Structure 1
Protein backbone atom coordinates (compact mmCIF):
# COMPACT_ATOMS: atom_id res chain seq x y z
CA UNK A 1 0.00 0.00 0.00
CA UNK A 2 0.89 3.68 0.29
CA UNK A 3 4.02 4.50 2.30
CA UNK A 4 2.89 8.07 2.91
CA UNK A 5 5.23 11.00 2.23
CA UNK A 6 6.94 13.39 4.64
CA UNK A 7 9.80 15.85 4.34
CA UNK A 8 12.07 13.89 6.64
CA UNK A 9 15.54 14.66 7.90
CA UNK A 10 18.23 12.24 8.96
CA UNK A 11 18.36 11.29 12.65
CA UNK A 12 20.50 14.01 14.29
CA UNK A 13 22.10 12.02 17.13
CA UNK A 14 25.52 11.57 15.54
CA UNK A 15 25.73 15.34 15.03
CA UNK A 16 24.33 16.34 18.43
CA UNK A 17 27.26 14.50 19.99
CA UNK A 18 29.66 16.86 18.21
CA UNK A 19 28.09 20.21 19.10
CA UNK A 20 29.95 22.59 21.42
CA UNK A 21 30.01 26.29 22.29
CA UNK A 22 32.80 28.65 21.16
CA UNK A 23 33.40 32.13 22.56
CA UNK A 24 35.90 34.86 21.66
CA UNK A 25 35.58 38.35 23.06
CA UNK A 26 31.86 38.77 23.70
CA UNK A 27 30.64 36.65 20.78
CA UNK A 28 29.42 33.09 21.38
CA UNK A 29 28.35 30.68 18.65
CA UNK A 30 28.32 26.99 17.76
CA UNK A 31 31.24 24.76 16.89
CA UNK A 32 31.61 21.22 15.54
CA UNK A 33 33.88 18.95 17.62
CA UNK A 34 35.34 16.00 15.66
CA UNK A 35 38.22 14.03 17.19
CA UNK A 36 40.56 16.71 18.60
CA UNK A 37 39.42 19.61 16.39
CA UNK A 38 36.66 22.20 16.70
CA UNK A 39 35.31 23.95 13.61
CA UNK A 40 33.44 27.28 13.67
CA UNK A 41 32.74 30.42 11.58
CA UNK A 42 35.73 32.76 11.59
CA UNK A 43 33.59 35.81 12.29
CA UNK A 44 33.58 34.67 15.93
CA UNK A 45 36.69 36.88 16.22
CA UNK A 46 34.92 40.03 15.04
CA UNK A 47 33.92 42.91 17.30
CA UNK A 48 30.95 45.13 16.41
CA UNK A 49 33.38 47.56 14.72
CA UNK A 50 34.98 44.89 12.50
CA UNK A 51 31.87 43.53 10.79
CA UNK A 52 31.62 45.96 7.88
CA UNK A 53 35.11 45.59 6.43
CA UNK A 54 37.00 42.98 8.50
CA UNK A 55 40.50 41.79 7.74
CA UNK A 56 40.43 38.34 9.30
CA UNK A 57 44.16 37.81 8.80
CA UNK A 58 44.84 40.90 10.90
CA UNK A 59 42.15 40.14 13.48
CA UNK A 60 43.36 36.55 13.96
CA UNK A 61 47.07 37.27 14.32
CA UNK A 62 46.08 39.30 17.39
CA UNK A 63 44.64 36.17 19.02
CA UNK A 64 46.20 33.33 21.04
CA UNK A 65 44.95 29.83 21.85
CA UNK A 66 43.54 31.14 25.11
CA UNK A 67 41.51 33.87 23.38
CA UNK A 68 39.12 31.04 22.53
CA UNK A 69 36.81 29.46 25.10
CA UNK A 70 35.25 26.21 23.96
CA UNK A 71 32.78 24.37 26.14
CA UNK A 72 31.25 20.91 25.92
CA UNK A 73 28.29 21.28 28.23
CA UNK A 74 29.79 22.78 31.38
CA UNK A 75 33.31 21.47 30.80
CA UNK A 76 35.95 23.67 29.20
CA UNK A 77 38.08 22.18 26.43
CA UNK A 78 41.55 23.73 26.39
CA UNK A 79 42.61 24.98 22.97
CA UNK A 80 46.19 23.98 22.17
CA UNK A 81 46.27 25.32 18.62
CA UNK A 82 44.41 27.25 15.93
CA UNK A 83 44.39 28.03 12.22
CA UNK A 84 42.09 29.59 9.65
CA UNK A 85 40.93 27.66 6.60
CA UNK A 86 39.02 29.95 4.27
CA UNK A 87 36.02 31.24 6.26
CA UNK A 88 36.35 28.74 9.13
CA UNK A 89 38.61 28.44 12.16
CA UNK A 90 40.09 25.09 13.18
CA UNK A 91 40.78 24.94 16.90
CA UNK A 92 42.79 22.01 18.25
CA UNK A 93 41.79 20.86 21.74
CA UNK A 94 43.68 18.68 24.22
CA UNK A 95 41.05 15.92 24.31
CA UNK A 96 39.25 13.86 21.68
CA UNK A 97 35.48 13.62 21.31
CA UNK A 98 34.63 9.93 21.91
CA UNK A 99 31.27 10.59 20.25
CA UNK A 100 32.91 11.40 16.92
CA UNK A 101 31.04 9.29 14.32
CA UNK A 102 32.55 8.02 11.06
CA UNK A 103 32.44 11.08 8.80
CA UNK A 104 33.61 12.97 5.73
CA UNK A 105 33.43 16.53 4.42
CA UNK A 106 31.52 16.99 1.16
CA UNK A 107 30.66 20.06 -0.90
CA UNK A 108 27.16 19.50 -2.26
CA UNK A 109 25.71 20.62 -5.57
CA UNK A 110 22.82 23.11 -5.83
CA UNK A 111 19.51 21.26 -5.87
CA UNK A 112 20.76 18.57 -3.50
CA UNK A 113 19.10 18.13 -0.09
CA UNK A 114 20.44 17.87 3.45
CA UNK A 115 19.45 18.03 7.11
CA UNK A 116 20.12 21.03 9.34
CA UNK A 117 20.57 20.73 13.11
CA UNK A 118 19.76 24.22 14.38
CA UNK A 119 21.73 24.94 17.56
CA UNK A 120 22.09 27.79 20.04
CA UNK A 121 24.85 28.14 22.65
CA UNK A 122 26.16 24.73 21.61
CA UNK A 123 22.85 22.98 22.34
CA UNK A 124 20.52 21.39 19.77
CA UNK A 125 17.18 23.09 19.13
CA UNK A 126 15.68 21.09 16.28
CA UNK A 127 16.28 19.37 12.96
CA UNK A 128 14.72 19.95 9.55
CA UNK A 129 15.34 18.94 5.94
CA UNK A 130 15.93 21.43 3.14
CA UNK A 131 17.51 21.83 -0.27
CA UNK A 132 20.35 24.01 -1.37
CA UNK A 133 18.76 26.47 -3.80
CA UNK A 134 20.01 26.67 -7.38
CA UNK A 135 21.38 30.12 -6.44
CA UNK A 136 23.27 28.56 -3.50
CA UNK A 137 21.18 30.11 -0.71
CA UNK A 138 19.19 28.16 1.87
CA UNK A 139 15.60 29.03 2.74
CA UNK A 140 16.19 28.17 6.36
CA UNK A 141 14.88 29.16 9.76
CA UNK A 142 17.74 30.65 11.80
CA UNK A 143 17.81 33.13 14.68
CA UNK A 144 20.77 35.12 16.01
CA UNK A 145 23.14 32.77 17.82
CA UNK A 146 22.55 30.01 15.29
CA UNK A 147 25.84 30.39 13.50
CA UNK A 148 28.00 27.30 13.53
CA UNK A 149 25.01 24.96 13.13
CA UNK A 150 25.71 22.36 10.41
CA UNK A 151 23.97 20.64 7.51
CA UNK A 152 24.55 16.97 6.77
CA UNK A 153 23.54 13.68 5.16
CA UNK A 154 23.94 10.20 6.64
CA UNK A 155 24.74 7.11 4.60
CA UNK A 156 24.48 4.03 6.79
CA UNK A 157 26.72 4.93 9.73
CA UNK A 158 28.78 7.63 8.02
CA UNK A 159 28.02 11.34 8.45
CA UNK A 160 28.73 13.59 5.46
CA UNK A 161 28.90 17.19 6.74
CA UNK A 162 28.18 19.63 3.90
CA UNK A 163 27.22 22.96 5.46
CA UNK A 164 28.00 25.38 8.30
CA UNK A 165 25.78 28.43 8.80
CA UNK A 166 27.28 31.95 8.63
CA UNK A 167 24.72 34.64 7.77
CA UNK A 168 21.42 36.02 6.53
CA UNK A 169 20.90 38.03 3.32
CA UNK A 170 18.83 41.27 3.10
CA UNK A 171 16.15 39.22 1.38
CA UNK A 172 15.75 36.94 4.39
CA UNK A 173 17.49 33.83 3.01
CA UNK A 174 20.61 32.22 4.45
CA UNK A 175 24.17 31.55 3.29
CA UNK A 176 27.09 29.51 4.54
CA UNK A 177 30.09 27.36 3.66
CA UNK A 178 31.17 23.73 3.26
CA UNK A 179 33.37 22.27 6.02
CA UNK A 180 36.49 23.51 4.22
CA UNK A 181 35.25 27.05 4.80
CA UNK A 182 34.40 27.85 1.18
CA UNK A 183 31.15 29.73 0.67
CA UNK A 184 28.29 28.35 -1.36
CA UNK A 185 27.40 31.20 -3.70
CA UNK A 186 29.04 34.59 -4.49
CA UNK A 187 29.07 35.74 -0.87
CA UNK A 188 31.62 37.05 1.63
CA UNK A 189 31.40 37.09 5.43
CA UNK A 190 30.92 40.81 6.07
CA UNK A 191 27.90 43.04 6.67
CA UNK A 192 27.69 44.68 3.26
CA UNK A 193 24.88 44.80 0.70
CA UNK A 194 25.06 41.49 -1.18
CA UNK A 195 22.54 39.84 -3.48
CA UNK A 196 22.12 36.27 -4.72
CA UNK A 197 21.59 35.39 -8.36
CA UNK A 198 18.08 34.78 -9.64
CA UNK A 199 16.74 31.57 -8.16
CA UNK A 200 14.77 28.90 -9.98
CA UNK A 201 12.66 25.86 -9.13
CA UNK A 202 14.59 22.57 -9.06
CA UNK A 203 12.98 20.77 -12.01
CA UNK A 204 14.66 17.40 -11.35
CA UNK A 205 13.20 17.35 -7.83
CA UNK A 206 9.67 18.34 -8.87
CA UNK A 207 9.71 15.41 -11.33
CA UNK A 208 11.10 13.01 -8.70
CA UNK A 209 8.27 14.20 -6.46
CA UNK A 210 5.66 13.56 -9.17
CA UNK A 211 7.03 10.00 -9.36
CA UNK A 212 6.69 9.69 -5.57
CA UNK A 213 3.01 10.57 -5.89
CA UNK A 214 2.59 7.86 -8.53
CA UNK A 215 4.35 5.07 -6.65
CA UNK A 216 2.07 6.13 -3.79
CA UNK A 217 -0.97 5.44 -5.97
CA UNK A 218 -1.91 8.85 -7.39
CA UNK A 219 -2.02 9.47 -11.17
CA UNK A 220 -4.59 12.26 -11.72
CA UNK A 221 -2.06 14.68 -13.24
CA UNK A 222 -0.80 12.36 -16.00
CA UNK A 223 -1.90 12.78 -19.62
CA UNK A 224 -1.69 11.10 -23.03
CA UNK A 225 0.90 13.55 -24.33
CA UNK A 226 4.67 13.42 -24.49
CA UNK A 227 7.29 16.01 -25.27
CA UNK A 228 10.85 16.45 -26.44
CA UNK A 229 13.42 17.69 -23.93
CA UNK A 230 13.71 20.95 -25.87
CA UNK A 231 9.97 21.67 -25.99
CA UNK A 232 9.64 20.93 -22.28
CA UNK A 233 12.37 23.45 -21.48
CA UNK A 234 10.84 26.17 -23.67
CA UNK A 235 7.77 26.00 -21.43
CA UNK A 236 9.40 25.32 -18.05
CA UNK A 237 11.82 28.21 -18.44
CA UNK A 238 8.87 30.56 -18.81
CA UNK A 239 7.93 29.57 -15.27
CA UNK A 240 11.39 30.11 -13.76
CA UNK A 241 12.19 26.38 -13.72
CA UNK A 242 15.74 25.03 -14.05
CA UNK A 243 16.49 23.79 -17.57
CA UNK A 244 16.31 19.98 -17.65
CA UNK A 245 19.27 18.03 -19.10
CA UNK A 246 19.76 14.48 -20.40
CA UNK A 247 21.73 13.69 -17.25
CA UNK A 248 18.68 14.61 -15.17
CA UNK A 249 16.39 12.33 -17.17
CA UNK A 250 18.94 9.50 -16.82
CA UNK A 251 18.92 10.07 -13.05
CA UNK A 252 15.16 9.50 -13.13
CA UNK A 253 15.73 6.18 -14.89
CA UNK A 254 15.13 3.98 -11.81
CA UNK A 255 11.93 5.81 -10.80
CA UNK A 256 10.76 5.68 -14.41
CA UNK A 257 11.28 1.90 -14.50
CA UNK A 258 9.54 1.33 -11.17
CA UNK A 259 6.41 3.18 -12.29
CA UNK A 260 6.32 2.40 -16.00
CA UNK A 261 6.09 6.11 -16.77
CA UNK A 262 8.60 7.43 -19.32
CA UNK A 263 10.55 10.48 -18.14
CA UNK A 264 9.46 12.58 -21.10
CA UNK A 265 5.85 11.54 -20.52
CA UNK A 266 6.18 12.79 -16.95
CA UNK A 267 7.65 16.00 -18.35
CA UNK A 268 4.52 16.36 -20.47
CA UNK A 269 2.48 16.00 -17.27
CA UNK A 270 4.52 18.72 -15.52
CA UNK A 271 4.16 20.92 -18.63
CA UNK A 272 0.37 20.70 -18.33
CA UNK A 273 0.48 21.38 -14.59
CA UNK A 274 2.47 24.57 -15.10
CA UNK A 275 0.16 25.80 -17.87
CA UNK A 276 -3.17 24.95 -16.19
CA UNK A 277 -2.44 24.87 -12.46
CA UNK A 278 -3.79 22.18 -10.10
CA UNK A 279 -7.44 23.32 -10.27
CA UNK A 280 -7.87 23.07 -6.51
CA UNK A 281 -6.46 19.55 -6.31
CA UNK A 282 -3.44 18.30 -4.37
CA UNK A 283 -0.48 16.03 -5.02
CA UNK A 284 0.86 14.14 -2.00
CA UNK A 285 -1.17 16.57 0.10
CA UNK A 286 0.44 19.60 -1.54
CA UNK A 287 -1.27 22.39 -3.48
CA UNK A 288 2.06 23.45 -4.99
CA UNK A 289 4.79 21.68 -6.94
CA UNK A 290 7.31 20.61 -4.27
CA UNK A 291 11.01 20.79 -5.14
CA UNK A 292 12.87 19.74 -1.96
CA UNK A 293 13.02 16.01 -2.70
CA UNK A 294 15.76 14.52 -4.91
CA UNK A 295 15.28 11.31 -6.91
CA UNK A 296 17.41 9.60 -4.26
CA UNK A 297 15.25 10.89 -1.40
CA UNK A 298 12.17 9.51 -3.16
CA UNK A 299 13.60 6.03 -3.78
CA UNK A 300 14.77 5.83 -0.15
CA UNK A 301 11.47 6.95 1.42
CA UNK A 302 9.11 5.11 -0.92
CA UNK A 303 11.22 1.98 -1.45
CA UNK A 304 13.89 1.65 1.25
Structure 2
Protein backbone atom coordinates (compact mmCIF):
# COMPACT_ATOMS: atom_id res chain seq x y z
CA UNK A 1 0.00 0.00 0.00
CA UNK A 2 0.95 3.73 -0.35
CA UNK A 3 2.09 5.60 -3.53
CA UNK A 4 5.32 7.70 -3.79
CA UNK A 5 7.30 9.48 -6.58
CA UNK A 6 9.96 6.72 -6.99
CA UNK A 7 13.37 6.73 -8.79
CA UNK A 8 15.29 3.61 -9.98
CA UNK A 9 18.37 2.52 -7.95
CA UNK A 10 21.23 4.89 -9.04
CA UNK A 11 24.11 2.42 -8.27
CA UNK A 12 24.69 1.32 -11.93
CA UNK A 13 24.91 5.04 -13.07
CA UNK A 14 26.95 6.27 -9.98
CA UNK A 15 29.94 4.25 -11.41
CA UNK A 16 29.75 5.96 -14.88
CA UNK A 17 30.05 9.60 -13.57
CA UNK A 18 33.41 11.40 -14.22
CA UNK A 19 34.64 15.07 -14.17
CA UNK A 20 35.54 16.85 -17.49
CA UNK A 21 37.69 20.04 -17.15
CA UNK A 22 38.69 22.17 -20.22
CA UNK A 23 40.53 25.47 -19.51
CA UNK A 24 38.65 27.07 -16.53
CA UNK A 25 35.16 25.43 -17.04
CA UNK A 26 34.46 22.06 -15.25
CA UNK A 27 31.26 19.92 -15.68
CA UNK A 28 29.92 16.28 -15.44
CA UNK A 29 30.74 13.43 -17.90
CA UNK A 30 29.42 9.86 -18.55
CA UNK A 31 32.07 7.08 -19.01
CA UNK A 32 30.78 3.97 -20.93
CA UNK A 33 33.26 1.47 -22.52
CA UNK A 34 36.36 3.46 -23.77
CA UNK A 35 34.31 6.69 -24.45
CA UNK A 36 33.46 9.69 -22.15
CA UNK A 37 30.29 11.70 -23.12
CA UNK A 38 29.72 15.36 -21.96
CA UNK A 39 28.04 18.62 -23.15
CA UNK A 40 30.00 20.38 -26.00
CA UNK A 41 29.80 23.78 -24.12
CA UNK A 42 32.92 22.70 -22.08
CA UNK A 43 34.91 24.33 -25.00
CA UNK A 44 33.12 27.69 -24.23
CA UNK A 45 34.72 30.72 -22.43
CA UNK A 46 32.88 33.59 -20.58
CA UNK A 47 33.29 35.71 -23.81
CA UNK A 48 31.84 33.08 -26.25
CA UNK A 49 28.75 32.11 -24.11
CA UNK A 50 26.66 34.68 -26.15
CA UNK A 51 27.09 32.94 -29.60
CA UNK A 52 29.99 30.41 -29.71
CA UNK A 53 31.46 28.99 -33.00
CA UNK A 54 31.85 25.35 -31.72
CA UNK A 55 33.42 24.07 -35.01
CA UNK A 56 36.15 26.81 -34.76
CA UNK A 57 36.63 26.14 -30.95
CA UNK A 58 37.10 22.32 -31.41
CA UNK A 59 39.53 22.78 -34.39
CA UNK A 60 41.94 24.83 -32.13
CA UNK A 61 41.82 21.97 -29.52
CA UNK A 62 43.84 18.71 -28.96
CA UNK A 63 43.58 15.41 -26.94
CA UNK A 64 45.74 16.74 -24.02
CA UNK A 65 43.56 19.95 -23.70
CA UNK A 66 40.79 17.77 -22.07
CA UNK A 67 41.25 16.77 -18.35
CA UNK A 68 39.13 13.70 -17.26
CA UNK A 69 39.18 12.35 -13.62
CA UNK A 70 37.31 9.37 -11.99
CA UNK A 71 37.89 10.12 -8.27
CA UNK A 72 41.70 10.60 -7.83
CA UNK A 73 42.35 8.60 -11.10
CA UNK A 74 43.32 10.45 -14.38
CA UNK A 75 42.31 8.96 -17.82
CA UNK A 76 44.42 9.63 -21.00
CA UNK A 77 42.52 11.03 -24.07
CA UNK A 78 43.39 9.17 -27.37
CA UNK A 79 40.65 10.77 -29.57
CA UNK A 80 37.93 13.50 -29.58
CA UNK A 81 34.90 14.11 -31.91
CA UNK A 82 31.80 16.43 -31.70
CA UNK A 83 28.32 14.86 -32.36
CA UNK A 84 25.57 17.57 -32.50
CA UNK A 85 25.77 19.25 -29.00
CA UNK A 86 27.79 16.40 -27.29
CA UNK A 87 31.59 15.81 -26.95
CA UNK A 88 32.83 12.16 -27.25
CA UNK A 89 36.35 11.46 -25.79
CA UNK A 90 38.10 8.12 -26.64
CA UNK A 91 40.25 7.12 -23.58
CA UNK A 92 43.06 4.51 -23.06
CA UNK A 93 41.10 2.57 -20.32
CA UNK A 94 37.59 0.97 -20.69
CA UNK A 95 35.24 1.63 -17.69
CA UNK A 96 35.36 -1.62 -15.63
CA UNK A 97 31.87 -0.79 -14.13
CA UNK A 98 30.11 -0.25 -17.56
CA UNK A 99 26.61 -1.84 -17.28
CA UNK A 100 24.37 -3.31 -20.04
CA UNK A 101 23.35 0.00 -21.74
CA UNK A 102 21.22 1.44 -24.61
CA UNK A 103 20.73 5.04 -25.91
CA UNK A 104 16.98 5.81 -26.55
CA UNK A 105 15.10 9.07 -27.42
CA UNK A 106 12.02 9.17 -25.07
CA UNK A 107 8.65 10.75 -26.16
CA UNK A 108 6.82 13.63 -24.39
CA UNK A 109 5.11 12.31 -21.19
CA UNK A 110 7.59 9.38 -20.74
CA UNK A 111 9.30 9.59 -17.28
CA UNK A 112 12.90 8.82 -16.07
CA UNK A 113 15.16 8.98 -12.95
CA UNK A 114 17.68 11.92 -12.88
CA UNK A 115 21.03 11.59 -10.97
CA UNK A 116 22.18 15.18 -10.14
CA UNK A 117 26.05 15.45 -10.05
CA UNK A 118 28.64 18.25 -9.37
CA UNK A 119 32.37 17.62 -10.23
CA UNK A 120 31.59 14.00 -11.35
CA UNK A 121 30.20 13.25 -7.81
CA UNK A 122 26.49 12.30 -7.34
CA UNK A 123 24.42 14.36 -4.78
CA UNK A 124 20.90 12.77 -5.24
CA UNK A 125 18.15 11.23 -7.49
CA UNK A 126 14.53 12.27 -8.37
CA UNK A 127 11.89 11.11 -10.94
CA UNK A 128 10.44 13.55 -13.58
CA UNK A 129 8.73 13.64 -17.05
CA UNK A 130 9.65 15.09 -20.49
CA UNK A 131 6.98 17.89 -20.63
CA UNK A 132 4.94 18.43 -23.86
CA UNK A 133 6.91 21.72 -24.50
CA UNK A 134 10.17 19.56 -24.37
CA UNK A 135 11.53 21.06 -21.07
CA UNK A 136 11.68 19.35 -17.60
CA UNK A 137 10.86 20.76 -14.10
CA UNK A 138 14.11 19.59 -12.40
CA UNK A 139 16.51 20.62 -9.56
CA UNK A 140 19.86 21.79 -11.06
CA UNK A 141 22.44 24.33 -9.68
CA UNK A 142 25.58 25.70 -11.48
CA UNK A 143 27.83 22.80 -12.69
CA UNK A 144 24.89 20.27 -12.83
CA UNK A 145 25.22 20.02 -16.69
CA UNK A 146 26.40 16.54 -17.86
CA UNK A 147 24.08 14.90 -15.24
CA UNK A 148 21.97 12.16 -16.99
CA UNK A 149 18.38 10.77 -16.91
CA UNK A 150 17.78 6.98 -17.33
CA UNK A 151 15.33 4.03 -16.91
CA UNK A 152 16.31 0.41 -15.88
CA UNK A 153 14.94 -2.71 -17.73
CA UNK A 154 16.08 -5.78 -15.65
CA UNK A 155 19.87 -4.92 -15.50
CA UNK A 156 19.95 -2.87 -18.80
CA UNK A 157 20.31 0.97 -18.35
CA UNK A 158 18.46 3.06 -21.05
CA UNK A 159 20.06 6.59 -21.11
CA UNK A 160 17.49 9.14 -22.49
CA UNK A 161 18.68 12.59 -21.14
CA UNK A 162 21.92 14.60 -20.67
CA UNK A 163 21.47 18.03 -18.91
CA UNK A 164 22.80 21.25 -20.58
CA UNK A 165 21.14 24.55 -19.46
CA UNK A 166 18.39 26.51 -17.59
CA UNK A 167 15.82 28.92 -19.22
CA UNK A 168 14.72 32.27 -17.62
CA UNK A 169 11.55 30.37 -16.41
CA UNK A 170 13.78 28.34 -13.99
CA UNK A 171 13.00 25.10 -15.99
CA UNK A 172 15.57 22.86 -17.77
CA UNK A 173 16.48 21.83 -21.39
CA UNK A 174 18.90 19.08 -22.58
CA UNK A 175 19.75 16.38 -25.20
CA UNK A 176 19.60 12.62 -25.86
CA UNK A 177 23.08 10.92 -25.79
CA UNK A 178 23.55 11.44 -29.58
CA UNK A 179 23.61 15.21 -28.73
CA UNK A 180 20.18 16.16 -30.22
CA UNK A 181 18.30 18.65 -27.92
CA UNK A 182 14.77 17.69 -26.74
CA UNK A 183 12.68 20.52 -28.28
CA UNK A 184 13.85 23.48 -30.43
CA UNK A 185 16.62 24.84 -28.08
CA UNK A 186 20.33 25.60 -28.88
CA UNK A 187 23.41 25.70 -26.50
CA UNK A 188 24.06 29.52 -26.12
CA UNK A 189 22.95 32.54 -23.95
CA UNK A 190 19.99 33.93 -26.02
CA UNK A 191 16.17 34.53 -25.86
CA UNK A 192 14.93 30.87 -25.63
CA UNK A 193 11.25 30.70 -24.47
CA UNK A 194 9.50 27.31 -23.93
CA UNK A 195 5.90 27.09 -25.30
CA UNK A 196 2.72 26.98 -23.12
CA UNK A 197 2.94 23.63 -21.22
CA UNK A 198 -0.06 21.19 -21.44
CA UNK A 199 -0.98 18.38 -18.94
CA UNK A 200 -0.09 14.71 -19.80
CA UNK A 201 -3.73 13.39 -19.83
CA UNK A 202 -2.78 9.63 -20.11
CA UNK A 203 -0.53 10.07 -16.97
CA UNK A 204 -3.30 11.76 -14.82
CA UNK A 205 -5.73 8.85 -15.66
CA UNK A 206 -3.01 6.28 -14.67
CA UNK A 207 -2.52 8.27 -11.38
CA UNK A 208 -6.34 8.13 -10.73
CA UNK A 209 -6.22 4.28 -11.26
CA UNK A 210 -3.40 4.06 -8.62
CA UNK A 211 -5.66 6.05 -6.17
CA UNK A 212 -8.59 3.55 -6.68
CA UNK A 213 -6.12 0.64 -5.96
CA UNK A 214 -4.81 2.40 -2.76
CA UNK A 215 -8.39 3.04 -1.46
CA UNK A 216 -8.94 6.74 -2.47
CA UNK A 217 -12.10 6.62 -4.71
CA UNK A 218 -14.28 9.61 -3.52
CA UNK A 219 -13.83 11.20 -7.04
CA UNK A 220 -15.39 8.14 -8.86
CA UNK A 221 -18.61 9.52 -10.49
CA UNK A 222 -21.71 7.72 -11.96
CA UNK A 223 -21.32 9.04 -15.60
CA UNK A 224 -19.44 7.89 -18.76
CA UNK A 225 -18.38 9.87 -21.93
CA UNK A 226 -16.77 9.51 -25.44
CA UNK A 227 -13.15 10.20 -26.63
CA UNK A 228 -14.38 13.13 -28.84
CA UNK A 229 -16.57 14.61 -26.01
CA UNK A 230 -13.65 14.28 -23.47
CA UNK A 231 -10.97 15.57 -25.96
CA UNK A 232 -13.20 18.73 -26.37
CA UNK A 233 -13.05 19.44 -22.56
CA UNK A 234 -9.28 18.50 -22.55
CA UNK A 235 -8.17 21.21 -25.10
CA UNK A 236 -10.22 23.71 -22.95
CA UNK A 237 -8.04 22.98 -19.82
CA UNK A 238 -4.65 22.72 -21.69
CA UNK A 239 -4.81 18.86 -21.55
CA UNK A 240 -2.94 16.85 -24.28
CA UNK A 241 -5.34 14.92 -26.60
CA UNK A 242 -6.26 11.33 -25.50
CA UNK A 243 -5.51 8.80 -28.33
CA UNK A 244 -6.67 5.20 -29.12
CA UNK A 245 -3.02 4.26 -28.15
CA UNK A 246 -3.47 5.97 -24.69
CA UNK A 247 -6.75 4.00 -23.99
CA UNK A 248 -5.01 0.73 -25.14
CA UNK A 249 -2.01 1.35 -22.74
CA UNK A 250 -4.49 1.83 -19.79
CA UNK A 251 -6.30 -1.50 -20.64
CA UNK A 252 -4.27 -3.37 -17.95
CA UNK A 253 -5.23 -0.79 -15.21
CA UNK A 254 -8.83 -0.76 -16.63
CA UNK A 255 -9.04 -4.61 -16.30
CA UNK A 256 -7.61 -4.87 -12.71
CA UNK A 257 -9.81 -2.10 -11.14
CA UNK A 258 -13.04 -2.94 -13.10
CA UNK A 259 -13.36 0.75 -14.27
CA UNK A 260 -13.68 1.28 -18.09
CA UNK A 261 -11.21 3.99 -19.36
CA UNK A 262 -14.08 6.30 -20.58
CA UNK A 263 -15.73 6.07 -17.08
CA UNK A 264 -12.41 7.34 -15.55
CA UNK A 265 -12.34 9.98 -18.40
CA UNK A 266 -15.86 11.11 -17.27
CA UNK A 267 -14.68 11.26 -13.57
CA UNK A 268 -11.65 13.43 -14.68
CA UNK A 269 -14.03 15.81 -16.63
CA UNK A 270 -15.93 16.37 -13.29
CA UNK A 271 -12.64 17.11 -11.38
CA UNK A 272 -11.65 19.62 -14.16
CA UNK A 273 -15.15 21.29 -14.24
CA UNK A 274 -15.68 21.42 -10.39
CA UNK A 275 -12.12 21.35 -8.86
CA UNK A 276 -11.26 19.30 -5.70
CA UNK A 277 -12.99 21.55 -3.04
CA UNK A 278 -9.81 21.42 -0.84
CA UNK A 279 -9.79 17.55 -0.87
CA UNK A 280 -6.71 15.27 -1.43
CA UNK A 281 -6.14 12.34 -3.89
CA UNK A 282 -3.09 10.20 -2.82
CA UNK A 283 -2.09 13.10 -0.47
CA UNK A 284 -2.07 15.70 -3.34
CA UNK A 285 -4.39 18.78 -3.74
CA UNK A 286 -3.30 18.84 -7.47
CA UNK A 287 -3.76 16.39 -10.42
CA UNK A 288 -0.34 14.58 -10.78
CA UNK A 289 0.70 13.97 -14.47
CA UNK A 290 4.33 12.73 -13.83
CA UNK A 291 3.40 9.00 -13.45
CA UNK A 292 3.14 6.74 -16.60
CA UNK A 293 0.85 3.66 -16.80
CA UNK A 294 4.11 1.56 -16.59
CA UNK A 295 5.20 3.58 -13.47
CA UNK A 296 1.80 2.89 -11.75
CA UNK A 297 1.88 -0.87 -12.73
CA UNK A 298 5.59 -1.20 -11.60
CA UNK A 299 4.88 0.48 -8.19
CA UNK A 300 1.50 -1.39 -7.72
CA UNK A 301 3.06 -4.74 -8.95
CA UNK A 302 6.58 -4.61 -7.33
CA UNK A 303 8.86 -5.10 -10.43
CA UNK A 304 12.60 -5.24 -9.39
TM-score, normalised relative to structure 1: 0.98
Offset, 1:153: 0.3
Q: CA deviation at 1:74?
A: 1.0
In the alignment, the residues of structure 1 paired with residue 178 and residue 92 of structure 2 have an alpha-carbon distance, to the nearest angstrom, of 22
1:78 deviates by 0.7
Question: 1:143-154, aligned counterparts within 5 Å?
Answer: 143-154=141-152
Classify the secondary structure of the residue corresponding to 1:261.
Answer: coil
Give how far 1:30 is off.
Answer: 0.3
Structure 1 runs not aligned, ≥5 long:
none
**What is the Cα deviation at residue 197 of structure 1?**
1.7
CA deviations over 1:114-158 (Å, ceiling 9, x no partner): 000000000000000001101110100100000100000001100
Superposed CA RMSD in Å reads 0.7
Q: Distance in 2 between matches of 1:49 and 1:280?
A: 51
Alignment partners' CA distance in 1, 2:145 and 2:298: 30
Q: Deviations over 1:192-233 (max 9, x none)?
A: 011112210100000000000011122110111011111111
1:245: how far off?
A: 1.1
Q: Report how far residue 303 of structure 1 moved.
A: 1.5
State the aligned residue count: 302
Structure 2 partner of 1:121: 119
Which deviates more, 106-115 or 213-222? 213-222
Deviation per residue, 1:238-286 (Å, 9 max, x gap):
1111111111111111100010000000000000001111112111111
Aligned match for 2:65, one of 64, 67, 72: 67
Higher mean C-alpha displacement, 157-166 vs 218-227: 218-227
What are structure 2's unaligned runs of at least 5 residues? none
The CA deviation string for residues 50-94 of structure 1, in whole angstroms up to 9 with x for no partner, is 111111111001100000000000111111110011100000110
Q: Where does residue 288 of structure 1 map in the other structure?
A: 286
**What TM-score does the superposition give when structure 2 sets the normalisation length?**
0.98
Question: Which runs of at least 4 in structure 1 moved beyond 4 Å after TM superposition?
Answer: none
